[PDB]
C-alpha cells in the first residue's frame, strides 16, 4: 500500500498520520476513546512494507514531490528512501529482506540504527531542531544523494524525516509537539530528551500496554503515565506483542499499588542485597 | 580501549565469584563486587553497556563500564 504524509498544514499532517494508523492497526479495547486510541499493528508477513509519499513541504504546492519512504509494516522502521525522479531505492544494510519491485535498489553499507545515523550525521537527536525549512533542506539533500554510503547531510535528513513520520506515527506526543512547526508562525520543533526516551522505550511500552485494565498508572522504565489521558496523549501505535517486545524473562507486568509496572523495571531495582553488606564488601 | 558496546546477551556468576557478561558476541569478566547488581539491572532493562579494557579479546577482564539509556 502507498500513503501520503502531507506537511501543508497541521490538519493535513495529522489527517495523514491518522489515515495510516487506521489502515495498518487495530485499537486496544481498553485504551480507546472515540476514534483516538493506542492501536496494535496488524500482523503482516516479514518483509511486508508500505510506501509513504512526502508532500506539502511547500504548502499545498506540487513541488519537492520526488521523495518516498519505504516503511517495514510490522515494526514501522524506515528501510530506506526512494528518489522517484531517478527511480532509485537507497536501502539500509539491515533491510536486505525488503524488496521493492520496479525500482533500482542500491544496497547501502550504512545501517539504520540511530547510533550509526547520529555518528554519520554528527547530530544528536536530543536537542535536534526540525522546521519546515530544515525539512526542505533534508528533502534536497536526499534528492542530491547518490552512492552506497550515507553522507553527513543525507543522514541528518533521515534523522529529521524518520522523527516526523514513523516516530510520530508511533507517538502522539511527537505528532503534537512537531506539528506546531507547520503553522504560519513557522516555529522550530526541538526534540527533547523525553521525546528521545519515548522512541527508545517503544518495544517495552508495546509489551506492557496490552495488559492495561484501568490501573491508576503505568510505569515502563523511565516512562510514567498517571492516567488514561496521559497514555492516549503520548502513545498512538504499538508493536504486536516481534523480537523488540521482549528483553528477558516472560512476565510482561506486575501490578503494585494499583500501578502497572513493567516487571523488568521492578526486578531491576529490587535486586539489591543488604546495603551495609554491599558497601563494605569491596 | 572501548572493547564492546551493546546489550547484555547473558550474564553469569562464576565459581571464583567474578561476574561475566556477553556483549557484542564476546565474554568479559569483572571482579568488581559493586558491578554485579548493576550489570544484572542493565541486562533486565536492555541498557546499552560499554565495556572498556586494555585487551578486548573474548575472555578479557574489565573494571570500567558505562550504562546508557540508548
Amino acid at each position: 500500500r502507498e500513503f501520503t504524509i502531507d506537511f501543508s498544514t497541521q490538519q493535513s499532517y495529522v489527517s495523514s498520520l491518522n489515515s495510516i494508523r487506521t489502515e495498518i492497526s487495530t485499537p486496544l479495547e481498553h485504551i480507546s476513546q472515540g476514534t483516538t486510541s493506542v492501536s496494535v499493528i496488524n500482523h503482516t508477513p516479514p518483509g511486508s512494507y508500505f510506501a509513504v509519499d512526502i508532500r506539502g513541504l511547500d504548502v499545498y504546492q506540487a513541488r519537492f514531490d520526488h521523495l518516498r519512504l519505504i516503511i517495514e509494516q510490522n515494526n514501522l522502521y524506515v528501510a530506506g528512501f526512494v528518489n522517484t525522479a531517478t527511480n532509485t531505492f537507497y536501502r539500509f544494510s539491515d533491510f536486505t529482506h525488503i524488496s521493492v519491485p520496479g525500482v533500482t535498489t542500491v544496497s547501502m553499507t550504512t545501517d539504520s540504527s540511530y547510533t550509526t545515523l547520529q555518528r554519520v550525521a554528527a547530530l544528536e537527536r536530543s536537542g535536534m531542531q526540525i522546521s519546515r525549512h530544515s525539512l526542505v533542506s533534508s528533502y534536497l539533500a536526499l534528492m542530491e544523494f547518490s552512492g552506497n554510503t550515507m553522507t553527513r547531510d543525507a543522514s541528518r535528513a533521515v534523522l529529521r524525516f524518520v522523527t516526523v513520520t514513523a516516530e510520530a506515527l508511533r507517538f502522539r506526543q511527537i505528532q503534537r509537539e512537531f506539528r506546531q512547526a507547520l503553522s504560519e508562525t513557522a516555529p522550530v520543533y526541538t526534540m527533547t530528551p523525553g521525546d528521545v526516551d519515548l522512541t527508545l522505550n517503544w518495544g517495552r511500552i508495546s509489551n506492557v500496554l496490552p495488559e492495561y485494565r484501568g490501573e491508576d498508572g503505568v510505569r515502563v522504565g523511565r516512562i510514567s503515565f498517571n492516567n488514561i489521558s496521559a497514555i492516549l496523549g503520548t502513545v498512538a501505535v504499538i508493536l504486536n506483542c516481534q523480537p523488540e517486545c521482549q528483553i528477558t524473562g516472560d512476565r510482561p507486568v506486575i501490578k503494585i499499588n494499583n500501578t502497572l509496572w513493567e516487571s523488568n523495571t521492578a526486578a531491576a531495582f529490587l535486586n539489591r542485597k543488604s546495603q551495609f553488606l554491599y558497601t563494605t564488601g569491596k | 580501549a572501548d572493547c564492546a558496546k551493546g546489550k547484555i546477551e547473558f550474564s553469569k556468576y562464576n565459581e571464583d565469584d567474578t561476574f561475566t557478561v556477553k556483549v557484542d558476541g564476546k565474554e568479559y569478566w569483572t571482579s568488581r563486587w559493586n558491578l554485579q547488581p548493576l550489570l544484572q539491572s542493565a541486562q533486565l532493562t536492555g541498557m546499552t553497556v560499554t565495556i572498556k579494557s586494555s585487551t578486548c579479546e573474548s575472555g578479557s577482564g574489565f573494571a570500567e563500564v558505562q550504562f546508557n539509556n540508548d
Binding site: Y77, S112 | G6, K7
Partner: peptide, 5 residues
C-alpha cells in the same frame, strides 16, 4: 540490538 530508525 540497539534501536533502529
Amino acid at each position: 540490538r540497539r534501536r533502529r530508525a
